[PDB]
Tab-separated table of C-alpha atoms (C1' of nucleotides) and ligand atoms in Angstrom:
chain	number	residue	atom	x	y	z
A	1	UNK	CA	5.828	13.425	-2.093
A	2	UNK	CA	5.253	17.245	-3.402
A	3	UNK	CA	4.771	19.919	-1.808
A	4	UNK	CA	1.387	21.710	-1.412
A	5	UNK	CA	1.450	26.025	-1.949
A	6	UNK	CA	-2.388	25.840	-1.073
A	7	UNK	CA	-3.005	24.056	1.802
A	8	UNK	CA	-7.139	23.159	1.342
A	9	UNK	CA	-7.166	21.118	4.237
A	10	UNK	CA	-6.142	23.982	6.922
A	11	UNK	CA	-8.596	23.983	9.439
A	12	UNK	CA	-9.447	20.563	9.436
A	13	UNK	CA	-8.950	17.437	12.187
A	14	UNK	CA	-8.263	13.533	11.254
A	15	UNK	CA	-7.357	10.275	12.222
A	16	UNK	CA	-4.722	7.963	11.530
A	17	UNK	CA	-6.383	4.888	11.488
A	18	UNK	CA	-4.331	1.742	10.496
A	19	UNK	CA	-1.651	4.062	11.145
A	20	UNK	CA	1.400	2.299	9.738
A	21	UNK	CA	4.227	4.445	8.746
A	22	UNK	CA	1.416	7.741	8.804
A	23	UNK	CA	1.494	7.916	5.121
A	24	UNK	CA	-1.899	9.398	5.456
A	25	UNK	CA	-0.632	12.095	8.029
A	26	UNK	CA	2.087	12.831	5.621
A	27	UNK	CA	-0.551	13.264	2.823
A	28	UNK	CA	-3.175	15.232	4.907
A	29	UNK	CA	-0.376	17.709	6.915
A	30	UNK	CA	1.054	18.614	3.605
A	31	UNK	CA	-2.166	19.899	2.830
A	32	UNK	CA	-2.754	21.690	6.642
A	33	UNK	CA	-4.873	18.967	8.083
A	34	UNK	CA	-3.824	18.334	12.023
A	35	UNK	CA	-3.902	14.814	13.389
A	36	UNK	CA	-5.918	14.287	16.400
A	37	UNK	CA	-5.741	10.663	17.013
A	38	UNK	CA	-3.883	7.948	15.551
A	39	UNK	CA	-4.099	4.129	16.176
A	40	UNK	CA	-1.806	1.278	14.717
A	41	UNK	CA	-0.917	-2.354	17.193
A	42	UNK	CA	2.409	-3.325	15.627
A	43	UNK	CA	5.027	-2.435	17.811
A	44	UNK	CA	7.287	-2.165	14.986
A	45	UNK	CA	5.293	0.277	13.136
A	46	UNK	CA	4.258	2.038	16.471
A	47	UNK	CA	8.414	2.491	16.939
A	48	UNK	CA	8.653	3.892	13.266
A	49	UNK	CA	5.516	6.056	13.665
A	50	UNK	CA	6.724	7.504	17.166
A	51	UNK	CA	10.430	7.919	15.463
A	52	UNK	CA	8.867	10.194	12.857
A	53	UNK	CA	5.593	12.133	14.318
A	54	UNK	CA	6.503	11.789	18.542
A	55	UNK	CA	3.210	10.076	19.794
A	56	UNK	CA	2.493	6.140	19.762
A	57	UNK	CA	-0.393	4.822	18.062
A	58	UNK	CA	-3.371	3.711	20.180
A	59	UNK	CA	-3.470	-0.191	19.939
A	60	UNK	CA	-6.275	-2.285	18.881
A	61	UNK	CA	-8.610	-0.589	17.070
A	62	UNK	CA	-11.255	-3.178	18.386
A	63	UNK	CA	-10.787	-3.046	21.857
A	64	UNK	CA	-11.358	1.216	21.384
A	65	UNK	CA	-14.757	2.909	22.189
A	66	UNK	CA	-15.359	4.765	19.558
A	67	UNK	CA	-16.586	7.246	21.949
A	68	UNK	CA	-13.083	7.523	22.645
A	69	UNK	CA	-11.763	8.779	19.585
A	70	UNK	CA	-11.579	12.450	19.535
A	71	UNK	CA	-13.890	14.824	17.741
A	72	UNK	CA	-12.311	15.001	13.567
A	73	UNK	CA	-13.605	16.437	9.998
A	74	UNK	CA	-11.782	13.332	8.132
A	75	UNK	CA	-11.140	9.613	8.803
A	76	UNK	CA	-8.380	8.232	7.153
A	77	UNK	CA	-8.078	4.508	7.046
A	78	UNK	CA	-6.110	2.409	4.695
A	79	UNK	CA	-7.415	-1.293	6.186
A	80	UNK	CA	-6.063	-4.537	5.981
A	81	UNK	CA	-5.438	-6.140	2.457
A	82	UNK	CA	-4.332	-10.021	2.906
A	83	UNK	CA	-8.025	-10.842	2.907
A	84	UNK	CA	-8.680	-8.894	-0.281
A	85	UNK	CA	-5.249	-9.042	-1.945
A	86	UNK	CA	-5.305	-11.408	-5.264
A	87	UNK	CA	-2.188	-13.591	-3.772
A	88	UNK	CA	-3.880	-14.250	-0.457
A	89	UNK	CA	-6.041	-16.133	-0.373
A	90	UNK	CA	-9.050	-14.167	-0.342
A	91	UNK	CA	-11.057	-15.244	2.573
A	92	UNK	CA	-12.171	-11.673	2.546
A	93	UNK	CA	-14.807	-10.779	5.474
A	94	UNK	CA	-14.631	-14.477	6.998
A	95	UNK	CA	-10.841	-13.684	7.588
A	96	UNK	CA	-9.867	-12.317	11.151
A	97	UNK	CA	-8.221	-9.945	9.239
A	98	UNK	CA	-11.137	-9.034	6.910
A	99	UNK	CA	-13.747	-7.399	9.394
A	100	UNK	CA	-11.713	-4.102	10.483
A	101	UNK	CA	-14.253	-1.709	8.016
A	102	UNK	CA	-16.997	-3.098	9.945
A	103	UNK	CA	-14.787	-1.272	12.794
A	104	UNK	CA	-14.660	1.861	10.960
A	105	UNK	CA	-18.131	1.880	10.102
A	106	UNK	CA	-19.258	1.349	14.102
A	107	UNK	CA	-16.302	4.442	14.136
A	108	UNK	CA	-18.340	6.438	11.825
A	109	UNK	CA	-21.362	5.727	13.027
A	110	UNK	CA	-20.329	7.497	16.596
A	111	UNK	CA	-17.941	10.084	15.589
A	112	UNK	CA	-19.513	10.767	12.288
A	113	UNK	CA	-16.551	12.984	10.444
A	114	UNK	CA	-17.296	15.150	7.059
A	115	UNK	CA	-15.059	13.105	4.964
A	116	UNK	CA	-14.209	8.631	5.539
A	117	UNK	CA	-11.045	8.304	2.938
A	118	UNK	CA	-10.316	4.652	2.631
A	119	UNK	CA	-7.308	2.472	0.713
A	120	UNK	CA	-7.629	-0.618	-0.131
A	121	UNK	CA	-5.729	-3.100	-2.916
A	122	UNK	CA	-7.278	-3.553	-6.224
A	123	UNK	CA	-8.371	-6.769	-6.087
A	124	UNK	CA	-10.562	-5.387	-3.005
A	125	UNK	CA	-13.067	-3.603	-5.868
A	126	UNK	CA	-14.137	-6.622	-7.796
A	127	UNK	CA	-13.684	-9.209	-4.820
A	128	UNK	CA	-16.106	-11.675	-4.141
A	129	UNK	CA	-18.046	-10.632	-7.816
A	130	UNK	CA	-17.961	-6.813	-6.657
A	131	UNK	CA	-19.933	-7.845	-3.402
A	132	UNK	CA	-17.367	-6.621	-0.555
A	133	UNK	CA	-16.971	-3.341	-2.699
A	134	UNK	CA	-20.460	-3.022	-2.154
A	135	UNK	CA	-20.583	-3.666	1.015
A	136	UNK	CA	-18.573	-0.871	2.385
A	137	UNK	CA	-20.196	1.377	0.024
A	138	UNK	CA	-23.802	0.564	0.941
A	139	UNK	CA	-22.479	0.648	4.697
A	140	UNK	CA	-21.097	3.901	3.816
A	141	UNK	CA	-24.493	4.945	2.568
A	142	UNK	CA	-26.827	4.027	5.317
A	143	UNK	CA	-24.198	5.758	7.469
A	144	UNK	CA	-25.238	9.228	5.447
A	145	UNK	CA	-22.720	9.466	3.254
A	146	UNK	CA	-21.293	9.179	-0.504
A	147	UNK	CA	-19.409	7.033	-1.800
A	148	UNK	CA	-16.902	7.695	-4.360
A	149	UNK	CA	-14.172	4.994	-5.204
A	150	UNK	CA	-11.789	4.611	-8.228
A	151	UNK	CA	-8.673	2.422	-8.661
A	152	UNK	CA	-5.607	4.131	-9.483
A	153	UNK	CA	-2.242	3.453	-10.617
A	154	UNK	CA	0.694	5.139	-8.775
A	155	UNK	CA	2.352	5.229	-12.011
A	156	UNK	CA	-0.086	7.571	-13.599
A	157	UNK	CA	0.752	10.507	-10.671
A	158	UNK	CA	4.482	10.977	-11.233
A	159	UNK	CA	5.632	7.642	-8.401
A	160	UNK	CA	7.793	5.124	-10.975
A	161	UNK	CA	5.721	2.185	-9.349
A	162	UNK	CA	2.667	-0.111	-10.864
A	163	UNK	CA	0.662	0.162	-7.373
A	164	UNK	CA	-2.993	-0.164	-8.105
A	165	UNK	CA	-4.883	0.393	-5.243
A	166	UNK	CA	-8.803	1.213	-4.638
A	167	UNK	CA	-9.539	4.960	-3.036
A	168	UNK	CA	-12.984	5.349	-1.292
A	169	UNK	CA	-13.528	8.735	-0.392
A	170	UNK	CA	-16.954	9.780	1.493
A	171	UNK	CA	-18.690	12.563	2.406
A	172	UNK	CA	-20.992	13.177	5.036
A	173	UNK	CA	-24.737	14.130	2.675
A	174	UNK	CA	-25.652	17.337	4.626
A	175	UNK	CA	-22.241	18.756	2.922
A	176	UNK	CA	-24.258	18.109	-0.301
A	177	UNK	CA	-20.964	17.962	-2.039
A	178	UNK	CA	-21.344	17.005	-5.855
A	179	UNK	CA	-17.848	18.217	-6.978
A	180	UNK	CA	-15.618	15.518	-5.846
A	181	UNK	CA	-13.191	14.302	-8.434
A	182	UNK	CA	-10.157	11.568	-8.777
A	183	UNK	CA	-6.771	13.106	-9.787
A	184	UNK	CA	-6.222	13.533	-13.144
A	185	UNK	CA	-3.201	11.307	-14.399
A	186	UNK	CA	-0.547	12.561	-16.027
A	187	UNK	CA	3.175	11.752	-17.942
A	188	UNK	CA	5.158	9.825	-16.148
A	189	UNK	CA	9.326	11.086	-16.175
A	190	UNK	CA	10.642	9.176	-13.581
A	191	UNK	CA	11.477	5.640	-13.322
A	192	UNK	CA	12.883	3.152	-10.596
A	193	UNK	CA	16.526	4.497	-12.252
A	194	UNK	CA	15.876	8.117	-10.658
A	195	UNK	CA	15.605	6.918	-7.204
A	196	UNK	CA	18.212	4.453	-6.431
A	197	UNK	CA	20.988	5.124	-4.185
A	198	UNK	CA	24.773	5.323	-5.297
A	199	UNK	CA	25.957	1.796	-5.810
A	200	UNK	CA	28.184	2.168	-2.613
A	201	UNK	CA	25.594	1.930	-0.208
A	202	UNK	CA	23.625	-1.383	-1.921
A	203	UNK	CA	26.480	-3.675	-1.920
A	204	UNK	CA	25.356	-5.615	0.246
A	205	UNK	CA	22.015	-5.631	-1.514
A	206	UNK	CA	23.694	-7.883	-4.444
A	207	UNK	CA	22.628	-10.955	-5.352
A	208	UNK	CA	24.264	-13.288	-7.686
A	209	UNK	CA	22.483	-16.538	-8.347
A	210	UNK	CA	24.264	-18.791	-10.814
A	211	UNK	CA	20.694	-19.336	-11.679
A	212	UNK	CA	19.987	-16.213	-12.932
A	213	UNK	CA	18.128	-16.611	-16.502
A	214	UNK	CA	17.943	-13.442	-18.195
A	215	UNK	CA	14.622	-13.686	-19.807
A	216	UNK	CA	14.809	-10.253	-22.137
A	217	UNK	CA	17.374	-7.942	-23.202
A	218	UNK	CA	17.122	-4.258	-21.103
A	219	UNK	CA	15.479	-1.302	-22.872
A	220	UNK	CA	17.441	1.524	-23.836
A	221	UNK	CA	13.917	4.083	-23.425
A	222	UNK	CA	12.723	4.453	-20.235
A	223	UNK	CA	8.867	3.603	-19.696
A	224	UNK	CA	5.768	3.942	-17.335
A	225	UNK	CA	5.419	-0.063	-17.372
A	226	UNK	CA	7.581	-2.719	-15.489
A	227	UNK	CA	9.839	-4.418	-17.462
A	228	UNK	CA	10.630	-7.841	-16.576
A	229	UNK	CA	14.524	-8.990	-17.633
A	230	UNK	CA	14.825	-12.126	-15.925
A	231	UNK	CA	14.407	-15.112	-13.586
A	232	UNK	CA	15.598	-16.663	-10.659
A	233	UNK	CA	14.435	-20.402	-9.500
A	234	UNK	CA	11.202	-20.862	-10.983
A	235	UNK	CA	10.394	-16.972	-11.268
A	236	UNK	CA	7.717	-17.371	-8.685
A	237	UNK	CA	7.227	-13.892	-6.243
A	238	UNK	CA	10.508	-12.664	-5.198
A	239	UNK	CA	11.977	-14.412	-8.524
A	240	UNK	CA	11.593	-11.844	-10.843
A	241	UNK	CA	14.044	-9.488	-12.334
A	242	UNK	CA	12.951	-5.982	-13.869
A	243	UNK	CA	14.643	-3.091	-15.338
A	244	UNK	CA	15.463	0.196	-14.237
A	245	UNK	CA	14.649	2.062	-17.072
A	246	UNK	CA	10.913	1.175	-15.958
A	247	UNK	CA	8.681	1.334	-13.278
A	248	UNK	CA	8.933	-0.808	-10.022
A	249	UNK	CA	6.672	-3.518	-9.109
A	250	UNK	CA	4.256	-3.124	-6.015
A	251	UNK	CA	6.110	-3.658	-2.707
A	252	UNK	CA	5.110	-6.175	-0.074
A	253	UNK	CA	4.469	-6.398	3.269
A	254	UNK	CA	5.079	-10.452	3.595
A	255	UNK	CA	6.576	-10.625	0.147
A	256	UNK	CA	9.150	-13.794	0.103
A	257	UNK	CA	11.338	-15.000	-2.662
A	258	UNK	CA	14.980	-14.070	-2.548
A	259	UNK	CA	14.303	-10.450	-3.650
A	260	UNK	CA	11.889	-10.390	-1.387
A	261	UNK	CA	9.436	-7.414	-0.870
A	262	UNK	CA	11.005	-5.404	-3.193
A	263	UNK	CA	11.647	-7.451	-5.998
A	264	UNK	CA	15.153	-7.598	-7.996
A	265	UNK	CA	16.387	-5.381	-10.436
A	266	UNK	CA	19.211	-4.943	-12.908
A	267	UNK	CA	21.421	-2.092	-11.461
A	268	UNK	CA	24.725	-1.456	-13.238
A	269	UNK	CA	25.414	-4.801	-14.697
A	270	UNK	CA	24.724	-6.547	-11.255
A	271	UNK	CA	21.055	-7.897	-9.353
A	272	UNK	CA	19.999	-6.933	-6.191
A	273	UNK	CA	16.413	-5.745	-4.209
A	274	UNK	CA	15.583	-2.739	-3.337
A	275	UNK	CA	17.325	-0.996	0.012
A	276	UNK	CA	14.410	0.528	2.408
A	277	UNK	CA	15.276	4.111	1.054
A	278	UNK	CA	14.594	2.995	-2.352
A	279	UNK	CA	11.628	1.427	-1.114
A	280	UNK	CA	10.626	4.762	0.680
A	281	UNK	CA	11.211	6.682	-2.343
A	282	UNK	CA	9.515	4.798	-4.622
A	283	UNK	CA	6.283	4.796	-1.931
A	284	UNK	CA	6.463	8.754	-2.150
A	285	UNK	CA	8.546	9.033	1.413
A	286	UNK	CA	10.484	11.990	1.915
A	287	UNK	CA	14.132	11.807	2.495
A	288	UNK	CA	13.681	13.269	5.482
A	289	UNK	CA	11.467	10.395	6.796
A	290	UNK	CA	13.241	7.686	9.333
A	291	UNK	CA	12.953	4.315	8.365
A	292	UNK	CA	12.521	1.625	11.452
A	293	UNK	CA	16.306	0.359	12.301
A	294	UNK	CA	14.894	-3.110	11.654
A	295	UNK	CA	15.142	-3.551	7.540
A	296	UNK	CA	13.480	-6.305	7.287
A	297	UNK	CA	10.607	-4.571	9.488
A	298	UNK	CA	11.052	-1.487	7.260
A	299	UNK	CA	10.727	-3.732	4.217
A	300	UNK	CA	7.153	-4.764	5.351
A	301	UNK	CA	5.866	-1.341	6.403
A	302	UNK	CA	7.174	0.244	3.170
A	303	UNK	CA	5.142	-3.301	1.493
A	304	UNK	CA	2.311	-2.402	3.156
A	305	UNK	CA	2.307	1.257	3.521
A	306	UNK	CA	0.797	4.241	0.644
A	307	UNK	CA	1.735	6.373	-2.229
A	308	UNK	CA	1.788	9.346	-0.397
A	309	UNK	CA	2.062	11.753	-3.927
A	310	UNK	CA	-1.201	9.992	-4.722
A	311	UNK	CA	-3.199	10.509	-1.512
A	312	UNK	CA	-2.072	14.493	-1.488
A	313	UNK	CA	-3.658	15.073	-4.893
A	314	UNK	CA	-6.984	12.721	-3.312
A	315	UNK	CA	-6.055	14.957	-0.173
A	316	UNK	CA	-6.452	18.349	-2.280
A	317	UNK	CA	-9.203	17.532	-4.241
A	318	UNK	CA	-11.427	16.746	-1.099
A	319	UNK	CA	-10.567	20.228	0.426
A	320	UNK	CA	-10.783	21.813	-2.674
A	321	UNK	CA	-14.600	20.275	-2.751
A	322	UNK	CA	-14.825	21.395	1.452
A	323	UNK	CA	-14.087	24.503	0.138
A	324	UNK	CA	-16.322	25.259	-2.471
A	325	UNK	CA	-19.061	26.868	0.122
A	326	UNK	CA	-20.752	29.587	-3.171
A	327	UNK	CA	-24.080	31.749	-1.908
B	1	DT	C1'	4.452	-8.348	17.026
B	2	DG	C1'	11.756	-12.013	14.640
B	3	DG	C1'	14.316	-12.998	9.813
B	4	DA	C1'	14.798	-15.420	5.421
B	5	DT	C1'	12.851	-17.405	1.364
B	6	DG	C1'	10.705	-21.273	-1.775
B	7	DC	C1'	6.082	-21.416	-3.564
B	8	DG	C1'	0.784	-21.777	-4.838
B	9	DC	C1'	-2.555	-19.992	-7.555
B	10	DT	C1'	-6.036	-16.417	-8.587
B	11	DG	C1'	-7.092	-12.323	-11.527
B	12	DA	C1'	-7.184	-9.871	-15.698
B	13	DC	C1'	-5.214	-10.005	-19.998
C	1	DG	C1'	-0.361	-19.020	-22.317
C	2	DT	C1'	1.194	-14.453	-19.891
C	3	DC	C1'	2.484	-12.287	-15.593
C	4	DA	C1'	2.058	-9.732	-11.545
C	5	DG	C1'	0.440	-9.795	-6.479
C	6	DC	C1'	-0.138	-4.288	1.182
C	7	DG	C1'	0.532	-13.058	0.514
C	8	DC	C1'	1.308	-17.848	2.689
C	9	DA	C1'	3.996	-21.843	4.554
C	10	DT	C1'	7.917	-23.588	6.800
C	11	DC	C1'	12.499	-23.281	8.605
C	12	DC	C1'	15.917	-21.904	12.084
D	1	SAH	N1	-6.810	-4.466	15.089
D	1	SAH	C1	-5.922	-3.584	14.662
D	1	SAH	N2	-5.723	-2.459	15.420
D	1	SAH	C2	-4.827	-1.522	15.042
D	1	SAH	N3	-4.053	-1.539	13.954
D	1	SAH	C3	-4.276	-2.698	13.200
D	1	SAH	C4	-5.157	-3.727	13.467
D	1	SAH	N4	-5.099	-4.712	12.487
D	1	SAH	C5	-4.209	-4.293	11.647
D	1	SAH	N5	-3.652	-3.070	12.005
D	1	SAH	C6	-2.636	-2.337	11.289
D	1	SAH	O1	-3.214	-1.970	10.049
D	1	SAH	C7	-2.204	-1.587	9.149
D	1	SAH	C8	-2.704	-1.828	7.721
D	1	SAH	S1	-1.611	-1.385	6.347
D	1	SAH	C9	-1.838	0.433	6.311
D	1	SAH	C10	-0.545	1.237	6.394
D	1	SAH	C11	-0.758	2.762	6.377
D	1	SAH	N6	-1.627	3.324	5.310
D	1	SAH	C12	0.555	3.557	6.197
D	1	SAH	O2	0.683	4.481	5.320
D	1	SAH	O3	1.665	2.880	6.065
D	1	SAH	C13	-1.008	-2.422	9.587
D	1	SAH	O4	0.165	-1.633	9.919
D	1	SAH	C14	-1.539	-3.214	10.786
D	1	SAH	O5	-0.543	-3.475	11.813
DNA sequence: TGGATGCGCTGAC
DNA sequence: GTCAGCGCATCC
């Protein structure tokens, strides 16, 4: 993540919801907002979250009166994805998994906050012939408020990692705010090589696989693309091998294949998957930030978790729209 | 709501 | 035909 001299969002309340790792509160907080509620069911991820911020999420967001949730200026709520994602299987709304925005809606509808800022995966903005994007932003509308929603690439906001991912921000009409806008993009100088840790702490990382077919030779110029080198097994997910000298592919949450999650990459003449502080750093995570004891449970929040870089420059621009209050 | 991994197949070139 | 995907299925 980077750090934020102007903090826009002082002043301001939110809540975590879909919690996860809190890659939202990071976002926000760097920008002053304080977090007033946050709710997340895994235990796993509640451990993590409590192991970095003190407090344990709230569980099921469905079983919660909204009338519960304390008073806030901005929601933030990166939903479920399996139901949306291109390799599920796209069940969308008629997937147990797919109804938790009609949950933040009935949230909004009862707590109604200045600002609703949403994450969802790409596939979730032309899913379902653009209906289900629709949806939410039509839902958004009756509820009073904007809708604003782009897709953008980690990659293009200085995180070596091709993450697309839909943002839906929302503002509340009476704030008659009409100066809203995405992040710019800009050059990329820093690729899956910059992040890695010293090869002494990702031995055990290494995979060999006598069937290991180098597809393409590595690239001597680094890029803002991934760049596939080879294949293991039939070079299905998890099965892929990319180079350093490029951008990292988007991290999973259920990911399998023997690189699993991460994805394999040609370090130093040898294969291996990412190691959860790789995966942190190429998700925008601090050092500083503790990942769950569990790696494989760290694997699937990092997999499922948010750019954080990208959601402070979303974060900034909201305030910096907040803020614009001219006579 | 455990951990590991072989795989199907849809989406946008 | 290419290739990547907050995934799914099945196993211990
Ligand atoms: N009914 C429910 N109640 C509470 N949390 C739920 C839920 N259904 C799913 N979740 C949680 O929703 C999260 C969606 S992924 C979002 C992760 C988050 N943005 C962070 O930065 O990492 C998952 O961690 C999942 O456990």
């Amino acid at each position: 993540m980077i750090e934020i001299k102007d903090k826009q969002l002082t002043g301001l309340r939110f809540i975590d919801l879909f919690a996860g790792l809190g890659g939202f509160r990071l976002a926000l907080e760097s920008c002053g907002a304080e977090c007033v509620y946050s709710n997340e069911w895994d235990k796993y991820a509640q451990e993590v979250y409590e192991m970095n911020f003190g407090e344990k999420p709230e569980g099921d967001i469905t079983q919660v009166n909204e009338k519960t949730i304390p008073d806030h200026d901005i929601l933030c709520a990166g939903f479920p994805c399996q139901a949306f994602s291109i390799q599920g299987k796209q069940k969308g709304f008629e997937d147990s998994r797919g109804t938790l925005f009609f949950d933040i809606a009935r949230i909004v509808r009862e707590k109604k906050p200045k600002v609703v800022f949403m994450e969802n995966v790409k596939n979730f903005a032309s899913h379902d012939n653009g209906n289900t994007l629709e949806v939410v932003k039509n839902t958004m509308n009756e509820l009073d408020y904007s809708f604003h929603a782009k897709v953008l690439n980690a990659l293009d906001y200085g995180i070596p990692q091709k993450r697309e991912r839909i943002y839906m921000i929302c503002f509340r009409n009476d704030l008659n705010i009409q100066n809203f806008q995405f992040p710019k993009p800009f050059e990329l100088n820093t690729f899956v090589k910059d992040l890695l840790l010293p090869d002494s702490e990702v031995e055990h990382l290494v995979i060999d696989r006598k069937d290991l077919v180098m597809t393409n030779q590595e690239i001597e110029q680094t890029t803002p693309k991934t760049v596939r080198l080879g294949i293991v097994g039939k070079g299905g997910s998890g099965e892929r091998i990319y180079s350093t000298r490029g951008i990292a592919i988007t991290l999973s949450a259920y990911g399998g294949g023997i690189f699993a999650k991460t994805g394999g990459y040609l370090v130093n003449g040898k294969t291996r998957k990412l190691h959860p502080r790789e995966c942190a750093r190429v998700m925008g995570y601090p050092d500083s930030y503790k990942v769950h004891p569990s790696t494989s449970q760290a694997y699937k929040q990092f997999g499922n978790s948010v750019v954080i870089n990208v959601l402070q420059y979303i974060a900034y621009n909201i305030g910096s729209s907040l803020n614009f209050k001219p006579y």
